[PDB]
Structures are given as structure tokens and as C-alpha cells.
Amino acid sequence: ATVNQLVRKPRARKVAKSNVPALEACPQKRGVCTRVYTTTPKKPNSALRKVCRVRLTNGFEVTSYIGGEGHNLQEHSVILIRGGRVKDLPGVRYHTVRGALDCSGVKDRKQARSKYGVKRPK
Amino acid sequence: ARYLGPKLKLSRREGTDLFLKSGVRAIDTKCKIEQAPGQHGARKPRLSDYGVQLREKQKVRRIYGVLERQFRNYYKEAARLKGNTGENLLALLEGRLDNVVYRMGFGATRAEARQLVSHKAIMVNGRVVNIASYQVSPNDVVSIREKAKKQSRVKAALELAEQREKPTWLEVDAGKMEGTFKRKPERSDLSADINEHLIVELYSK
Amino acid sequence: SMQDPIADMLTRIRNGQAANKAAVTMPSSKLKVAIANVLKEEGFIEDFKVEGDTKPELELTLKYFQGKAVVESIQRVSRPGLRIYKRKDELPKVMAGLGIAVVSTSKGVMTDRAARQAGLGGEIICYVA
Amino acid sequence: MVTIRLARHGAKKRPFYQVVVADSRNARNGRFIERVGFFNPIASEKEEGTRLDLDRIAHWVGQGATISDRVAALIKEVNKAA
Amino acid sequence: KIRTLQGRVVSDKMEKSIVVAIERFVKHPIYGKFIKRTTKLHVHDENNECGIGDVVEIRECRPLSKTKSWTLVRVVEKAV
Amino acid sequence: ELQEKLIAVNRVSKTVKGGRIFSFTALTVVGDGNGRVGFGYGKAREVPAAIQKAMEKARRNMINVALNNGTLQHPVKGVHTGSRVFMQPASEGTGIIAGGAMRAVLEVAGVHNVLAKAYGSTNPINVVRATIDGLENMNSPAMVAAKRGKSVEEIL
RNA sequence: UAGCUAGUAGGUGGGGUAACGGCUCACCUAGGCGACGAUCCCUAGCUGGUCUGAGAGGAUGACCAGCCACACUGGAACUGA
RNA sequence: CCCGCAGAAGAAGCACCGGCUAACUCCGUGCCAGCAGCCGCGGUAAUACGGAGGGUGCAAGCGUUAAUCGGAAUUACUGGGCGUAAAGCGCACGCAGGCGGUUUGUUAAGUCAGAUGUGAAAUCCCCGGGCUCAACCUGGGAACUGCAUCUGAUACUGGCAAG
Ligand SMILES: [Mg+2]
Ligand SMILES: [Mg+2]
Ligand SMILES: [Mg+2]
Ligand SMILES: [Mg+2]
Ligand SMILES: [Mg+2]
Ligand SMILES: [Mg+2]
Ligand SMILES: [Mg+2]
Ligand SMILES: [Mg+2]
Ligand SMILES: [Mg+2]
Ligand SMILES: [Mg+2]
Ligand SMILES: [Mg+2]
Ligand SMILES: [Mg+2]
Ligand SMILES: [Mg+2]
């Protein structure tokens, strides 16, 4: 605080770590599903949330949510992951992209289709 | 790039008459102007500060037929220009070529005027200008070209305009079908129902 | 230790005004006298009086108007831990020109307005409002 | 050597040449010693379009500066017009 | 009038040469405090005339060694 | 002509043997648009009653403010316990560049051109209190002339 | 990361360079750098600028222009202004 | 770029609608399926999930993800703090360092003033001009808060001399 003190030792900028470090400042990244399973939510919620532990092209082993109702995923299924946490799966920091490589678009969706990789119905 | 939907729908939402119809027939006869559009029109929720500002901005945008990016650019230009920002914005909007054509009366609505301008019916200083956003300057003559001079729509529009209140900032010759844009209008010259201040606050959040 | 006599003087003035003291006394110095003179000229104090020979004492007579202190605020600016010097274009306007800023220039201690008129900057001693 | 030449500027299909003194080795729009005019080949009527600071050009030539053919033509035009 | 700098002789051991601190009283970029900064310079001095602690005026010249591109012009305040 | 506007309405609870007792507090601010501004803090079991109480309180205990041509007289700071506030006069046409509560208080007071910021806490009641205090303290050049025993022309 | 440096620091004399110079060599002196961070480690082309911000700052250095370095990797010179 | 031809003809989507945040209803499911930026929502009357109708916002784009600054006075020079919220070394001594009562003289290092040189062009900004308008291009200015040198002022700070 003292001007002398500042001169001696200046003020440190608060280095904020990223909350999506497997992306490595990429907007998406490709990976292979090591394992596909369901998991229980946190204490204000009950569900069986679909999630896949995925090995990324850059080495990282992350866990990724699978949004939408139903999915055509299994082991050795090449997917694109994006940023976003499930607040209620602890330690899940990434979403799968519905409507990418191995991942199919959601079946029978008419709204938020762009978010779930569904093509425009006739 | 243009709104192609229902116009009285827009008017009902705003509350006012936005002059989206020629004004032959009253808006009360063409629609429930008092009630807002849709299932939940018969309800007036209490509007937030943001909401009121947004509504005013929407009103002005609908009145002129400007989409948001263009409108924002207009606001920035106004802010840059010296003097009052809201006033400047209003002046720029007025300056637009489709608007001047409408004011002169070479179109019942601004939509009609815009159509004419796009379709190359309007000459600015003896030079066919095609852009509706073209800023008209002071002392600029703007005229119907002869091929569009035979248009029954143009003559009908002139009649309607004669019914309407004439603008002080233009001088128009009905037989010649030419009008001189003498000067950009002042805020006292434009309509009082527009609260430009709300727009300024909204784009200066 | 005493490390800033001007600051001490300013503090004394502030405390006197707070406490409704009629006069405030302190060890006199030439810089202090100059500052006091500037203050009197601008009308933030009623008077000053230097008294004594070996160790002289400055006695300022403080100024009140409606029961309350005339010098609303009085802050040191330049100080031993951190000197402040400004150029003529950078000279501050205290309270948007209502209050004065005592500036030590090459041509003696003067208010900011006077300094600006002359056309020279200097050590910004204090703001007074 | 030092030369006096046009540097292409403007937009596609709408060239605007800056007349610059420059060491011949340098690239067309690169490093240059002095900018001694401009030339606007699509300039309309009731527009100047050309402007060469002739005194500076004379000085550089005196120093020993070569002149581009186009720049020479421009100089000739300026002299005739004036 | 020639460009020249003054400084205290920090050392005079290396023969025909002295080291001359040229303290400058700069202001801090951010905090605005005035900090004493120092500039050591290897100065050439023929005849080994300078002592330690001596104030000395120096000018810049063609480099005389790996580190030595200054020469002394006049000594001042050469007390012990 | 006594323009008034309610800044914030907040529900507060008391606990009793039975259960919780809710009630509403309304912070309003009135002013004449020529200098006079006053805030009021009313409490009642229902919102309209609370607002009325607040309005009455605000209408009384107003305070005069030295305005120079619809703008501040000089840059002024103001504090009230957590709420430390800064507000600076600005050129005609700038508009009120001021937070929520702050914007309300300034507008009813009658300042048309200000640059404000609320530092510290932004708790509406405290922030309003801070702004009113700052506005009140702000003196005019006639005031400074009177204090220093000079003409206004000597001070400028 | 607290000590580092023997052509190391300076001198004299030869040689060398288009040019000053431990650039190089022989001898002499024992210096020189370092808490105003030497040395060591990690990262990085630099600038005009760019984005943001009321400003002070923060981040950044694609495009355009100035400077630098490199040309499969490691050395070397020749020709030549 | 202009002229002519035919005919509304060939040309509208994307997100969202519990609060923040502009925009609400019905049905389906029933802590499931699912949603989610935060707070949260769903356990059989869900404006929060999914469909529909209606609406809101942008529009040849609209969302999502990543990234930077802002808000964030949340590293606080401008512009924070430390009794109890995070924060006074357990206490002292003391080198470097930071700071220094009062008077006169001197110097002119800091400081201040003026000039000169430079601070490439582009960029930013101002007044113009050219593309039908805009973007874009462009003329002239302003700016480049800097650095250096010379000549001054000497109140303050520093140095030196005496008190
Ligand atoms: Mg960390
Ligand atoms: Mg739950
Ligand atoms: Mg577009
Ligand atoms: Mg030799
Ligand atoms: Mg030799
Ligand atoms: Mg690299
Ligand atoms: Mg590199
Ligand atoms: Mg800020
Ligand atoms: Mg590249
Ligand atoms: Mg090379
Ligand atoms: Mg090579
Ligand atoms: Mg290769
Ligand atoms: Mg090789």
C-alpha cells in the first residue's frame, strides 16, 4: 500500500485459471468415448444423467455430458466436445455436441433444433 | 433485410398508429388498435425501465422500417455528431430517402415509397438514386421520373399526402412531381410523441 | 519524528476549525508563512502573526462565517513520501475552481489561478476548499 | 538508386497512386524517403486528381534521383496545365 | 559546449580506467515516486589521475575496449 | 411540481411464535425539479400502504440543493455507511449517466446533466442517502464568495 | 535460481578489420559483473499499431508498413560494391 | 453503367418467452424423461422439461463454444484495506534503503518556462472530396501525451558551506 512498498514489490494481477482446460483455448475438440455411463445428480436433484468419459486428441481424459433425450453412443465413438458444466454432475465440465461426427441429432425435436443438431422438418 | 409481416400487428403492439396503412380507412376499423397482439393482448403488465426504453426504440424502428444493425449505426453516427444525440438520430432517420419520398407524398406508406425507390422511380438531383438509406442533403431536388410519373399509385399517394399534414422542411410541386429538401428538420419540427431520450439511454447502457 | 511541517500546519488548521478554536499556533517557518500569506489573500483565514526571535511562533486567526468553518477541506498533496509537480497545463482546479490550490512556483508560493496566469507550474502543496 | 515513382493505393479497380521518393530496391508500397505528391487516375471532373510538389521533385532530381516514366508524364501534364 | 556527464568514481583499480556511477533521479512510471537510479560506466582515464570517491566529468568517445567507451574530461571535488 | 418515484420495494420478515410475519418497505424519492429533493422510507404490511407512508415522509424533510443551470456545481463525493458515491457535472446534452437509485434521486432533484458512479455497496437506501448528502453539501459560487469575504467575480 | 567470470576486466606491444574494439595473440596488472537482481531456469520475434476502458490501465502483435532472425539439420567459407 | 422483355413471379430463417431479461397459455410426462449462464426447475393441476398455439428479439443470418478487456474500487498510481469479516512480525536492536526541525549563502541535480530537432507512412479523430448510398478509397489538418539539446527561473526537494 505504501508507495515505497509498491515500488519494492508491485501489485500482482490475479491469474485466473480456465474452467475448461482440456479445450486448451479451442472452441471444440475431438475425442473417442472411452466409456459411456449414467450418474446420479447432486442433492437437490434426482436423475440418471448420461455422460461419457472421453480421451481427447490432445491426451486429456475428461468427462462429458450427453444432452438431449436418447443417444446412439458407445465405446469407440468419435465425438466433438464443447464447453459447459452440468452444475449438477460434480466434476463434469464439457458437453458433447449433438449433431457432430459419431453423435446423432436428437430424434423428433422441433424446437432448439440448432442446439441439438436436428435438421429442419418439412 | 425488411420486415414482411403484419403491420397493424406492429402498430397494436406499440400502441400508437405507426402509419403502416395509407390512412384511407381508420385504424380502429382495420384492427383492435387498443388491444395488443395475440392470445394475451387483453392484459397490460407493468413495464420495467428496460422494457419501456425497448418499446420506444421498437416504435421508432417500426415507424421508419430500419433493422437493428442499421439503427445502431445511425445512433453511433448521431452520438459522434455534435449536439444532442437523440435529436441527431431523429434528424438522420428523417433524412433517409424513403422517408423524404413519403413526406413529399410519392407513396401512401413508407413501404410504398421504399418500393418506388428500390424500383428506380426517384431521381435525386436528376440522378436516379436507388438506395433507401441514401441520406438526402439540404437543397436537394427529388423527383418522380416520367415512367413512374404515369403511375396511378403515385397520383393517389399525392392525394393522400394532401390530406395529411404537410412538412415544413420540404417544398413539393404536385404537377411537376418534384420536391426540394430545403433543410434537415429540427426536433421541434418533428413529432412530440417520440421520446428520443429513452433510445439514447438504451443504446448508452 | 516530525517529518512534514506543512502537513502538520494543515492538520492543525483542520483540527482548529473542527474544534471551533479561535487561533492555532505552530512553529514558524518561511514556507509556512508564505502558505499562510496565500491563505489570507484568498480569505480562508482571518490573519497570521509571527512572534518571537529565537524560535518564532506563527499564530493564525481562523475564520468562521455562519457558525461553521470557512475552510471546508484542506488536504496536503505533495508530501515527503511522494512529491507532486505539475506543468502549467496540468495544474488542478480544486472544487471546479471554487477552492484554491497552493502551488510553489519559481516565482514564489502562489495559488493555482495565479500560477496559471503567470504561466508556470510547480510543486502542488495542497488543495483548499 | 533513389527514384521517384508511383505507389499503388486505394481499392480494387480504383487505383490511387502516391508519388514517393524511394530507394529503387525497396518494394513498390514499402519503405520510401519522401512522399512528394499523388495521382488519381479515376478522378472525375471538378476534382484535382493530380498534385505534384514540383520544387521537391526538382530538388531530388538535382540530388541525382531518377524518375519513373509515368511520373515524368505526370510532370509534363502538370506543366502544360499550369 | 560538448555533451558530458558527471559522476562519482565507484572504483579505480583497473589501470588507466575508472568506474563512474551516474545516479539519475528519475520518476517512477506508475507510482510517481522519484527513485534514485544508477548508471555504472567504465571510463578511460590516462595517467590514472582519478581517485575513488572523486567526482568526475566524462564525455562519450569511440570505444577503447570491450566495455570502455567514455573518457574523462575534468575532475572536480577530488578530496579525500 | 413534486415529481415522485419509488426506487425499491423490498419484503422483510419478522419471526414470532406462530411463524413468520412479512411486511413491505418502500423507498421513494420526491423533488420539485428546481433543487429540492427528499427521500422517504415507509413500512407497512402491504405495498400500497408502505408506498403512501414513504411518500408522506419524503414530501416532508426535503432539502435544498444549489444547482447551476440544471447541472452540478462541482464534482462531489458522498458517503453513507457502505455507499460511497461520486458525481460530476457534465456538458449540456450528456443526460443523467447514473445508476438506479442514483438516477432516480438525481432526476427528481432536477439535475439534467450528470456523470455519476456508485462505489462501495449499492444498497438502494444507503446509496440514496449518500447521494442526497453529497448534493446537500455541494455549495455554489455565491456561497463560496460569502464565506471567503470576496465578490463572486474575484473567485469565478 | 546468490553468487558469476581466466580472454575473464584493464594496460603495453604485434597481427587483423572497410572500420573502433580481447576481434586475435604475447606479456603485465588483478581485475570485472552482482540485491538498481549478476548467473541460472521458463516463456517470447520487436515496433507503428489492434481490441477494450471515461481515463489510468489491461490484453495483444493476424492483415498493412518499419526493424530483426531463419531457409531440411549442423559447420564453413568463396565470389562480390 | 444504361436500355428493353415477361411475370409476384426465383428468394426467411434462428434463438428465446420463471427472475436477472423483451415475450404465456394448453396438452404430454410425474424427482422420470429431461433443462440450466447464475438462482434454480421436474415427486400427477410444470408460464422453467417435450409438443403445439400465441408472443418477443435479431434477420441472410441466428445461436452455442472458445478467447480478451469491461463491469471488477475483485492488486485499489488515479482508486481498497488489516480490533471482531482475509490481514500488525511474539518483542526488540540494527546495516542497506525510505523519510528529515530551523536560518543564510551558493549550486542548479529533481522541478518549472521557452525555443530547436525528432516523434516514418498507414491507423485514431476533425473539415472536405470520390465510388448511386454505405462499407471502402482519399485531400488537408489535429494528434503522436515521448525523447534529446540549448537558453532561462530558483519557491520547493537534492547537493555543498556556515549557523
Ligand atoms: Mg492459480
Ligand atoms: Mg430438484
Ligand atoms: Mg446486412
Ligand atoms: Mg591493439
Ligand atoms: Mg596495430
Ligand atoms: Mg518461439
Ligand atoms: Mg520467433
Ligand atoms: Mg474502470
Ligand atoms: Mg502469419
Ligand atoms: Mg542472415
Ligand atoms: Mg541459407
Ligand atoms: Mg520442410
Ligand atoms: Mg548450412
Ligand SMILES: [Mg+2]
Ligand atoms: Mg557484383
Ligand SMILES: [Mg+2]
Ligand atoms: Mg570478396
Ligand SMILES: [Mg+2]
Ligand atoms: Mg419480463
Ligand SMILES: [Mg+2]
Ligand atoms: Mg430451453
Ligand SMILES: [Mg+2]
Ligand atoms: Mg398426467
Ligand SMILES: [Mg+2]
Ligand atoms: Mg399438465
Ligand SMILES: [Mg+2]
Ligand atoms: Mg426458464
Ligand SMILES: [Mg+2]
Ligand atoms: Mg418449455
Ligand SMILES: [Mg+2]
Ligand atoms: Mg480493475
Ligand SMILES: [Mg+2]
Ligand atoms: Mg476490501
Ligand SMILES: [Mg+2]
Ligand atoms: Mg481475523
Ligand SMILES: [Mg+2]
Ligand atoms: Mg503486537
Ligand SMILES: [Mg+2]
Ligand atoms: Mg528540511
Ligand SMILES: [Mg+2]
Ligand atoms: Mg538523505
Ligand SMILES: [Mg+2]
Ligand atoms: Mg535543470
Ligand SMILES: [Mg+2]
Ligand atoms: Mg503517423
